[PDB]
């Protein structure tokens, strides 16, 4: 239960370093979804990000693995969470 509050992510987007050399932008285009665009990885290889959603409607955190190429997008439901963190899987 650490991260940025989802309420602080807007349609404009915010950029994160998930782990060394791996950068992504998160956008919140509606209150139910989080859109992740992969921006850069070491060697431009497929990412290996762990997304952790917590708080809010969630009594316990939920995690999702995101393995996508730079330039690709992953949409995920936020499940009423308050908080999100990006880490290395």
Residue numbers in the entry: 4 to 92
Article, verbatim:
Plant pathogens secrete proteins, known as effectors, that function in the apoplast or inside plant cells to promote virulence. Previous studies of Fol-infected tomato identified a number of fungal proteins within the xylem sap. These secreted in xylem (SIX) effector proteins represent major pathogenicity determinants across different formae speciales of F. oxysporum. Currently, 14 SIX effectors have been identified in Fol consisting of small (less than 300 amino acids in length), secreted, cysteine-rich proteins. Here, we demonstrate that despite their sequence diversity, the Fol SIX effectors can be classified into a reduced set of structural families.
Avr2, a member of the ToxA-like effector family, exhibited structural similarity with the SIX7 and SIX8 models (Z-scores > 5). Analysis of the models and topology show that SIX7 and SIX8 both consist of a β-sandwich fold, strongly indicating their inclusion within the ToxA-like structural family. Here we demonstrate that both protein pairs contain a ToxA-like family member (Avr2, SIX8) and a structural family 4 member (SIX5, PSL1). Likewise, SIX8 and PSL1 are adjacent divergently transcribed genes in the Fol genome, and we demonstrate here a physical interaction between the proteins. We subsequently utilised AlphaFold2-Multimer through ColabFold to model the interaction. Manual inspection of the top 5 models (top model shown in Figure 4C) demonstrated that the thiol side chain of a free cysteine in PSL1 (Cys 37) and SIX8 (Cys 58) co-localised in the dimer interface, suggesting that an inter-disulfide bond may mediate the interaction. Collectively, these data demonstrated that the SIX8-PSL1 heterodimer is mediated via a disulfide bond. We crystallised and solved the structure of SIX8_C58S at 1.28 Å which confirms its inclusion within the ToxA-like structural family. Despite this, AlphaFold2 models were critical in solving the structure of SIX6 and SIX8 as templates for molecular replacement. When the modelling was repeated with the SIX8C58S experimentally derived structure included as a template, the interaction models and heterodimer interface were of higher quality and essentially identical. The region of SIX8 involved in the interaction with PSL1 was modelled incorrectly by AlphaFold2 when compared to the structure.
